[PDB]
Amino acid sequence: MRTYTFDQVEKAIEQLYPDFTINTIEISGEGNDCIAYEINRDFIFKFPKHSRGSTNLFNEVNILKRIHNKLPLPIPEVVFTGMPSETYQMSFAGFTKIKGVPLTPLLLNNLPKQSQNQAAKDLARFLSELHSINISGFKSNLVLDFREKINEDNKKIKKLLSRELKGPQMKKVDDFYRDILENEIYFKYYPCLIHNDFSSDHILFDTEKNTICGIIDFGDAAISDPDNDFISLMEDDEEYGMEFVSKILNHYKHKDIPTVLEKYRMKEKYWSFEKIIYGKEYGYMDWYEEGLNEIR
Numbered sequence: 001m002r003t004y005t006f007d008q009v010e011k012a013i014e015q016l017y018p019d020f021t022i023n024t025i026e027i028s029g030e031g032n033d034c035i036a037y038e039i040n041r042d043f044i045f046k047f048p049k050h051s052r053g054s055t056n057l058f059n060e061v062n063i064l065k066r067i068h069n070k071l072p073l074p075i076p077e078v079v080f081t082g083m084p085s086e087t088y089q090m091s092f093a094g095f096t097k098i099k100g101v102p103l104t105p106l107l108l109n110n111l112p113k114q115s116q117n118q119a120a121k122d123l124a125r126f127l128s129e130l131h132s133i134n135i136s137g138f139k140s141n142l143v144l145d146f147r148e149k150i151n152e153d154n155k156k157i158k159k160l161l162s163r164e165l166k167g168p169q170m171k172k173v174d175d176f177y178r179d180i181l182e183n184e185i186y187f188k189y190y191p192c193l194i195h196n197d198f199s200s201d202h203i204l205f206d207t208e209k210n211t212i213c214g215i216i217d218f219g220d221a222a223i224s225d226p227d228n229d230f231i232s233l234m235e236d237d238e239e240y241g242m243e244f245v246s247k248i249l250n251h252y253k254h255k256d257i258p259t260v261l262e263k264y265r266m267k268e269k270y271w272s273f274e275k276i277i278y279g280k281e282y283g284y285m286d287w288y289e290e291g292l293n294e295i296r
């Protein structure tokens, strides 16, 4: 992961947008991929921490441009773009800022009940429209096939951990993968466009109207299992919990809720493995150490 001063951020934009004068810079936020900077208190600029992050930034810019007026909520609108180099697919992107604060579980549970329920209904309508966006014109590259991903994760873990685990420990790893791959329910779904990081940090809230006023952070968006967009909201202290998501599910007219629960239960066991892989692919080593300790 690399880093920026405000000076570098300024000169970068100046190169490509010399007519855009900058008055104020502050850090808005940071994900796994980019630092986000708030320019003119009315524009969010994302600069990539590494080549992987930049590839995700490029994804996000491209998908946003295809869905920009298809959804019932505000999403980030692309106003400025950087350029490709040998290191980054896209050096930066600037977006219109969405005013609001994250809909944290704490905030959500302090709302009046009718507001909490409007939030579930508004999140369901958003998912329902997102999952219906026609995907013909999307890059076949964005398809994430879960069965494929799981087979590739199995090889990656073997090859990462082969000198770190004892043979009986790796055999149990292989058994875990095998059991997952024999269960069809994880792999039979109809691909559609999914947000794929759909959780409280990315759901913006207007505390004067007590209503959701935006969805942000489309860097992980893919064509994949729509159920991903529910399971990411379900974890208890950290996210919303099953009662709230079951309201979303009902508005969405989900027909197979026990399948969503079973996917969530498996994603919960799967976390240690993702920590190891995401660890290395993002070079965050504290995650790697953690998943490995867990696996033992």
Ligand SMILES: Nc1nc2c(ncn2[C@@H]2O[C@H](CO)[C@@H](O)[C@H]2O)c(=O)[nH]1
Residues within 6 Å of the ligand: 028, 029, 030, 031, 035, 036, 044, 076, 096, 097, 098, 099, 100, 101, 201, 202, 204, 216, 217
């Ligand atoms: N309030 C607000 N924060 C944003 C916006 N875009 C990015 N961020 C913050 O910067 C982080 C990384 O994108 C986000 O998770 C938010 O915390 C935005 O449009 N409005």
